[PDB]
Structure 1
Amino acid sequence: TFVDIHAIQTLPYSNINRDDLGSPKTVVYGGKERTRVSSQSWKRAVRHEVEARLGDKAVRTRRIISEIAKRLRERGWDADLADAGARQVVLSVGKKSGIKLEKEKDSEAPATSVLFYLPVPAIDELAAIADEHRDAVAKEAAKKTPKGILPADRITEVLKSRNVSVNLFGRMLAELPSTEVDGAVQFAHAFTVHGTTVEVDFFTAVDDIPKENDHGSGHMNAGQFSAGTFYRYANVNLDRLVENTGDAQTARTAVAEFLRAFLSTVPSGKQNATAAMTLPDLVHIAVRFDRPISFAPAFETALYGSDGYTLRACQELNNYAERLREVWPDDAIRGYATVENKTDLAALGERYDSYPALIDAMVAAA
């Protein structure tokens, strides 16, 4: 009921995910600093590739009122009635008077304080609900402090609609706890197997018109980059994903699609300057029934270096997988797929020739 996927993936001078000052994010793990890619970033890349491949897209937005306003404006509403009707949409729901709004900005509809996370056709249905009650909205638009006229139950039922991404990663809405969905995926922070010092690159953007006398750079700075073999891990709680989608067939497509997205996608951080696109060097899908187990302790002792870390990382993940299957006995259906053929890696289960064959075999096994 737990599908967990491990992956070793090298990235060359990427710097895919930056902190607030531009340096790549780091964990001091095992006593040694190791650059990391935050989980929310790779999770965002996964949800956008899943939505793009499975066709249905969900929208995490702070500006729901403005978007409902374009739909009501395309339905034939005047701009002022479209704005008042979308304000009625967010005003009619929640415990207090309405969903709290950020301070009003000139010429634009105010953003909600919290980020809504709902599929696109559900936003259009909210526009239809505000549309049927056009005269009541017109009457409340004339008052100084209009109240939430729209039915709350209908709107709350639209805000409860779940996308595949909502089913998979969950959502949170503090004013409407009825809409909160438990996530079915645990996404770990991808850290390096080996210790990495932050590499500094010094670049100078060149002025193009020649100066008459003093030729110098137009601007000069230094951006930090790093490279290494990241360890990646993720869980999928099949009981919750089946509980969220309801039917096991959509959960099956959601899981297979998630695993493929996990392998295929890259966060795209300064990719136009580094081209860090890469396939994972090794992938290991286990289908466990008792509990998920990350192999991150296997790489707590940082690798020394001077030699290619890929073979030693794959072999070390192998030894830790072997030692855990001996220490914690289980009937979990294992399986792996690797690029290197220098080792058999016996503990990672049955070997499969390709990543899609592995994903199809383990999803079919669950």
Structure 2
Amino acid sequence: TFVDIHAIQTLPYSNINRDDLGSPKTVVYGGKERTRVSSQSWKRAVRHEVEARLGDKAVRTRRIISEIAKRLRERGWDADLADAGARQVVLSVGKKSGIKLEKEKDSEAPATSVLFYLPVPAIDELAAIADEHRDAVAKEAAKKTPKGILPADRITEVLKSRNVSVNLFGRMLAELPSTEVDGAVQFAHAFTVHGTTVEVDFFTAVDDIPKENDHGSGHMNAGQFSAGTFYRYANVNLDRLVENTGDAQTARTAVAEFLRAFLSTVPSGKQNATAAMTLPDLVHIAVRFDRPISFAPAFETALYGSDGYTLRACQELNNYAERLREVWPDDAIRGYATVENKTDLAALGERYDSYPALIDAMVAAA
């Protein structure tokens, strides 16, 4: 019931996701600093690939009022009536008079205080609900403190509509806790197998028209980067995913597309300058029945180095997987796919020739 996926994937001079100053995020793990890719960024990359591939798109936005106003304006409403109606849409919900709004900024509709995570057709449906009550909104816009008119139950029922991404990753909305959905996927922070020092690159920007001052004395800012073999891990709690989507077939399609996306996507951090697009060197899917088990402790002892880390990392994940299967006996269906052929890697179960074949076999096995 717990599909867990392990992966080793090298990235060369990538710097995919930066802190506020441009340095790659680092973990002092095992006593040694190791650059890491934050889980939320990669989770976003996976959800964008999954939504792009399955066609259903979810929207996490803080500025819903402006968007509903644009749709109502395309429905034939005047601009001011569209703005007042969308304000009614967000005002008619929540315990108190309404959803908290940020200070109004000149010329634009106010942004909601909290981010919303709902499918696009749900936004269109909110526009329709605000549309059928056109006269009530028209009369209430004249009042100094307009109150919510739209039915609260209908709007709350529309905000409960679930996308595949919400079923898989979950959502949270504090003012309306009935709509909050628990995520079915756990996404670990991808860290390097070996300790990596941040390498500093000194770059300059050339001024094209010649000037004496332009060259000689002038110097240009230094930008940080890093490279390494990241270890990646993720869980999918199948019973919760089946409860969220409801049907088991949609859960199967969601999981398969998710795993394939998980392998395929890359966070895109300064990629127009580094081109770090790369496939994982090793993938290990397991269908665990008792509990998901990450193999991050296998690499808590940093690798020494001087020689290529991929082979040593694969052998270490293999060896650690064997020892865990001995120490924790289980009937979990294991399986792997690797590019190197130098080793058989006996503990990782039955070998599959390709990543899609592996994913299909494993997901079909659950």
Ranges of 4+ aligned residues in structure 1 off by more than 2 Å: 212-219
Whole-angstrom CA distance in 2 between matches of 1:320 and 1:164: 34
Q: Cα gap change, 1:221/1:126 in structure 2, threshold over 3 Å: closer, same or farther? A: same
Post-superposition shift, 1:324? 0.2
1:217 is displaced (CA, Å) by: 8.0
Instruction: Summarize the Cα distance change of 1:14–1:135 in structure 2 as closer, same or farther, 3 Å threshold.
Output: same
Partner secondary structure for residue 337 of structure 1: strand
User: Which deviations, in whole Å up to 9, do the C-alpha atoms of 1:149-203 show, x marking residues without a partner?
Assistant: 0000110011000000000000000000001000000000000000000100000
Cα 1:115/1:219, change in 2 over 3 Å: farther
CA RMSD of aligned residues (A): 0.9
Q: 1:128 to 1:325 in 2, by over 3 A?
A: same
Q: Secondary structure of 2:352's partner?
A: coil
Segment drifting more, 11-20 vs 209-218: 209-218
Match of 1:57 in 2: 57
Taking the aligned partners of 2:248 and 2:83, their CA distance within structure 1 comes to 41
Unaligned runs of 5+ in 2: none
Alpha-carbon spacing, 1:214–1:76, altered in 2? closer, same or farther (3 Å): closer
Shift of 1:219: 6.1
Q: CA deviation at 1:216?
A: 4.4
Equivalent pairs, count: 366
Q: Matched residues in 2 for 1:213 and 1:178: separation?
A: 64
Q: Is the 8 A contact 1:207 1:216 kept in 2?
A: no
Q: CA deviation at 1:215?
A: 2.7
Q: CA deviation at 1:20?
A: 1.1
Work out the CA distance in 2 between the residues paired with 1:283 and 1:224: 29
Q: Structure 1 regions of 5+ residues with no counterpart?
A: none
* Per-residue Cα deviation, 1:306-352 (whole angstroms, up to 9, x for no partner): 00000000000000000000000000000000000000000000000
- The aligned residue for residue 97 of structure 1 is 97
Q: CA 1:214–1:254 in structure 2 vs 1: closer, same or farther (change >3 Å)?
A: closer
Rate the CA distance shift 1:299–1:125 in 2: closer, same or farther, 3 A. Answer: same
| 1:79-115 CA distance string (max 9 Å, x none) | 0000000000000011111000000000000000000
What CA distance in whole angstroms lies between the structure 1 residues aligned with 2:354 and 2:286? 16
Structure 1 position 21, deviation (Å): 1.1
Q: Is the 8 A contact 1:200 1:224 kept in 2?
A: yes
Counterpart Cα distance in 1 of 2:271 and 2:233: 22
Contact in 2 for aligned 1:47/1:165 (Cα 8 Å): yes
Structure-2 change in CA distance of 1:217 and 1:335 (3 Å): farther
Distance 1:85 1:162 in 2: 24
Q: Deviations over 1:212-254 (max 9, x none)?
A: 5653487611111000000000000000100000000000000
Is the 1:202–1:223 Cα contact (8 Å) retained in structure 2?
yes
CA separation of 1:76 and 1:220: change in aligned 2, threshold 3 A: same
Q: Is the 8 A contact 1:92 1:152 kept in 2?
A: yes
On the 8 A contact 2:136/2:149 being kept in 1, the answer is yes
User: In structure 2, the residue corresponding to 1:66 is in which secondary structure?
Assistant: helix
Partners of 1:206 and 1:217 within 8 A in 2: no
Change (3 A) 1:338 1:213: closer
Map of 1:323 onto structure 2: 323
Q: What percent identity do the matched residue pairs reach? A: 100
Indicate the SS of the match to 1:67: helix
Instruction: Report how far residue 42 of structure 1 moved.
Output: 0.4
The alpha-carbon distance between structure 1 residues 145 and 301, as it changes in their structure 2 partners (threshold 3 A), is: same
Q: What SS does the corresponding residue of 2:341 show, helix, strand or coil?
A: coil
Instruction: For 2:67 and 2:276, locate their aligned partners in 1 and report how far apart those are by CA, in whole Å.
Output: 35
* 8 Å contact from structure 2 (residues 207, 214) kept in 1: no
**CA-to-aligned-CA distance 1:22-70 (integer Å, 9 cap, x gap):** 1000000000000000000000000000000000000000000000000
Question: Does the CA contact (< 8 Å) of 1:206 and 1:216 recur in 2?
Answer: no
Q: Label 1:219 to 1:83 Cα distance change in 2 as closer, same or farther (>3 A).
A: farther
Asked whether the equivalents of residues 298 and 316 of structure 2 are also in contact (C-alpha less than 8 Å), the reply is yes
1:117 Cα offset (Å) = 0.4
Over residues 100-146 of structure 1, what are the superposed CA-to-partner deviations in whole Å (9 max), with x where a residue is unaligned? 00000000000000000000000000000000000000000010000
Alpha-carbon distance change, 333 to 153 in structure 1, aligned in 2, over 3 angstroms: same
> Given that residues 337 and 352 in structure 1 are in contact (C-alpha distance below 8 angstroms), is that contact kept between their aligned partners in structure 2?
yes
